[PDB]
Design an enzyme around this catalytic site. Sequence first.
Site, PDB file in Angstrom:
ATOM      1  N   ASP A 142      12.250 -20.488  -0.491  1.00 14.97           N
ATOM      2  CA  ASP A 142      12.201 -19.699  -1.703  1.00 14.97           C
ATOM      3  C   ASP A 142      12.567 -18.249  -1.413  1.00 14.97           C
ATOM      4  O   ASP A 142      11.936 -17.318  -1.925  1.00 14.97           O
ATOM      5  CB  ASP A 142      10.834 -19.827  -2.370  1.00 14.97           C
ATOM      6  CG  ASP A 142      10.776 -19.187  -3.753  1.00 14.97           C
ATOM      7  OD1 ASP A 142      11.830 -18.916  -4.400  1.00 14.97           O
ATOM      8  OD2 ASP A 142       9.632 -18.969  -4.188  1.00 14.97           O
ATOM      9  N   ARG A 146      12.771 -11.057  -5.146  1.00 15.35           N
ATOM     10  CA  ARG A 146      11.381 -10.903  -5.568  1.00 15.35           C
ATOM     11  C   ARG A 146      10.421 -11.205  -4.418  1.00 15.35           C
ATOM     12  O   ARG A 146       9.296 -10.709  -4.429  1.00 15.35           O
ATOM     13  CB  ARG A 146      11.072 -11.814  -6.787  1.00 15.35           C
ATOM     14  CG  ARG A 146      10.856 -13.260  -6.439  1.00 15.35           C
ATOM     15  CD  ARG A 146      10.713 -14.210  -7.644  1.00 15.35           C
ATOM     16  NE  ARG A 146      12.005 -14.883  -7.778  1.00 15.35           N
ATOM     17  CZ  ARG A 146      12.348 -16.031  -7.206  1.00 15.35           C
ATOM     18  NH1 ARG A 146      11.455 -16.730  -6.516  1.00 15.35           N
ATOM     19  NH2 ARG A 146      13.593 -16.486  -7.364  1.00 15.35           N
ATOM     20  N   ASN A 147      10.856 -11.971  -3.404  1.00 16.12           N
ATOM     21  CA  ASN A 147      10.027 -12.314  -2.258  1.00 16.12           C
ATOM     22  C   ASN A 147      10.403 -11.553  -1.003  1.00 16.12           C
ATOM     23  O   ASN A 147      10.157 -12.035   0.109  1.00 16.12           O
ATOM     24  CB  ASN A 147      10.105 -13.804  -1.974  1.00 16.12           C
ATOM     25  CG  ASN A 147       9.489 -14.610  -3.061  1.00 16.12           C
ATOM     26  OD1 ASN A 147       8.635 -14.119  -3.816  1.00 16.12           O
ATOM     27  ND2 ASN A 147       9.943 -15.846  -3.193  1.00 16.12           N
ATOM     28  N   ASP A 160       6.049 -14.721   0.467  1.00 21.16           N
ATOM     29  CA  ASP A 160       5.962 -15.973  -0.295  1.00 21.16           C
ATOM     30  C   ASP A 160       6.231 -17.263   0.478  1.00 21.16           C
ATOM     31  O   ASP A 160       7.221 -17.942   0.268  1.00 21.16           O
ATOM     32  CB  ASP A 160       6.810 -15.920  -1.560  1.00 21.16           C
ATOM     33  CG  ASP A 160       6.204 -16.720  -2.689  1.00 21.16           C
ATOM     34  OD1 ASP A 160       5.727 -17.836  -2.429  1.00 21.16           O
ATOM     35  OD2 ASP A 160       6.195 -16.240  -3.835  1.00 21.16           O
TER      36      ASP A 160
HETATM   37  C1  LIG Z   1       8.096  -8.038  -7.359  1.00 22.84           C
HETATM   38  C2  LIG Z   1       6.732  -7.539  -7.821  1.00 22.84           C
HETATM   39  C3  LIG Z   1       5.928  -6.782  -6.772  1.00 22.84           C
HETATM   40  O1  LIG Z   1       5.818  -7.204  -5.692  1.00 22.84           O
HETATM   41  N1  LIG Z   1       5.287  -5.546  -7.157  1.00 22.84           N
HETATM   42  C4  LIG Z   1       4.484  -4.716  -6.280  1.00 22.84           C
HETATM   43  C5  LIG Z   1       4.127  -5.109  -4.996  1.00 22.84           C
HETATM   44  C6  LIG Z   1       3.354  -4.241  -4.244  1.00 22.84           C
HETATM   45  N2  LIG Z   1       2.904  -4.488  -2.888  1.00 22.84           N
HETATM   46  C7  LIG Z   1       2.563  -5.789  -2.379  1.00 22.84           C
HETATM   47  N3  LIG Z   1       2.212  -5.874  -1.129  1.00 22.84           N
HETATM   48  C8  LIG Z   1       1.899  -7.022  -0.588  1.00 22.84           C
HETATM   49  C9  LIG Z   1       1.946  -8.146  -1.376  1.00 22.84           C
HETATM   50  C10 LIG Z   1       2.315  -7.998  -2.690  1.00 22.84           C
HETATM   51  C11 LIG Z   1       2.392  -9.218  -3.594  1.00 22.84           C
HETATM   52  C12 LIG Z   1       2.492 -10.531  -3.187  1.00 22.84           C
HETATM   53  N4  LIG Z   1       2.552 -11.285  -4.255  1.00 22.84           N
HETATM   54  C13 LIG Z   1       2.658 -12.722  -4.245  1.00 22.84           C
HETATM   55  C14 LIG Z   1       2.502 -10.527  -5.359  1.00 22.84           C
HETATM   56  C15 LIG Z   1       2.535 -10.888  -6.721  1.00 22.84           C
HETATM   57  C16 LIG Z   1       2.470  -9.909  -7.690  1.00 22.84           C
HETATM   58  C17 LIG Z   1       2.370  -8.572  -7.325  1.00 22.84           C
HETATM   59  C18 LIG Z   1       2.337  -8.223  -5.984  1.00 22.84           C
HETATM   60  C19 LIG Z   1       2.406  -9.223  -5.003  1.00 22.84           C
HETATM   61  N5  LIG Z   1       2.624  -6.822  -3.165  1.00 22.84           N
HETATM   62  C20 LIG Z   1       2.963  -3.039  -4.756  1.00 22.84           C
HETATM   63  O2  LIG Z   1       2.198  -2.220  -3.956  1.00 22.84           O
HETATM   64  C21 LIG Z   1       2.011  -0.965  -4.498  1.00 22.84           C
HETATM   65  C22 LIG Z   1       3.310  -2.648  -6.019  1.00 22.84           C
HETATM   66  C23 LIG Z   1       4.068  -3.497  -6.784  1.00 22.84           C
HETATM   67  N6  LIG Z   1       4.440  -3.056  -8.118  1.00 22.84           N
HETATM   68  C24 LIG Z   1       5.599  -2.205  -8.294  1.00 22.84           C
HETATM   69  C25 LIG Z   1       3.682  -3.438  -9.290  1.00 22.84           C
HETATM   70  C26 LIG Z   1       4.630  -3.498 -10.492  1.00 22.84           C
HETATM   71  N7  LIG Z   1       5.614  -4.563 -10.336  1.00 22.84           N
HETATM   72  C27 LIG Z   1       5.132  -5.758 -10.999  1.00 22.84           C
HETATM   73  C28 LIG Z   1       6.882  -4.181 -10.927  1.00 22.84           C
END
Ligand SMILES: */C=C\C(=O)Nc1cc(Nc2nccc(-c3cn(C)c4ccccc34)n2)c(OC)cc1N(C)CCN(C)C
Length: 319
Positions: A142, A146-147, A160
Amino acid sequence: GEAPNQALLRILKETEFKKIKVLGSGAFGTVYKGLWIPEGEKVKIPVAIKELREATSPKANKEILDEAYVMASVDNPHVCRLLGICLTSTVQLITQLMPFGCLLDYVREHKDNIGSQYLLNWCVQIAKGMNYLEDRRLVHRDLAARNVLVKTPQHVKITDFGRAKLLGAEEGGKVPIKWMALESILHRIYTHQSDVWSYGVTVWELMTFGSKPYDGIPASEISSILEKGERLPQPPICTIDVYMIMVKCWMIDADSRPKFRELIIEFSKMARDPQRYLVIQGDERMHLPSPTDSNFYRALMDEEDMDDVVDADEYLIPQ
Ligand SMILES: */C=C\C(=O)Nc1cc(Nc2nccc(-c3cn(C)c4ccccc34)n2)c(OC)cc1N(C)CCN(C)C
């Protein structure tokens, strides 16, 4: 002929960490920005915390423990680092916080400041990630922008691992067709080479600054399109050299497609002369802020004093 996997799996106390905020909420799962403090280590580690949302709570715990199993077993600068798990009633996966978020989102928000040198390096770091997975005999299944997550604009890592498999092991709802290889779509076949096709799509997403692949097209149609021999279009900023690499990742014959270690070499070469291979206006003077060093920058991200902050990458077991 496979080695014993002696990775350690660490169990974290729910008391040791705090959820600062909700990074994402999805029908599938919810993720939190938080801070982890091992008792008596005098360190604070920024972390992301994940709880799944399956139809039944035991089935949710199954999917997330597999993911932990995979992350606990990989150690590489372009793969996402697992810290541990917490045994709350619904299991919690705890990994390194990537403050800039996923690449796909990042490339959308900052497209006007994103230069050729950055894009070629993400492409290198990503093939390094996957080639490391290939060495471990792991198929991601995958790969997509996005991952891919951003520790800093200079440093991304693959994530992911929920769908990850050993090559050829025995394993269908909401599969991501657009990123899928044709053999994957017709015959549920999956390979490192199948992963390579996904790398192609992933690269295109970066070169298009977040465009949706096969935009406006139904997933059912995609298998047929690919069978005709149509592919994704050449991104404007893309010299033919770069586009050619994408197109090879999208050959029908999987042995024909490039190998991740070959991708490393090729994108690594172009990163030496970036404007020769990506043409972007104003490329020469674009800057992406990277306040990794400032404690203050951390304080804002998690809203606390941060003198004893440590990034996971500098926090190594043995404890
Ligand atoms: C593509 C969306 C995203 O990752 N947004 C995001 C991510 C992070 N940091 C972070 N660090 C470790 C793991 C993750 C993570 C893993 N998975 C499966 C997630 C699902 C949904 C959200 C995050 C996930 N993420 C971050 O750190 C500040 C901010 C951030 N944003 C920008 C929040 C707003 N987005 C949804 C646009």
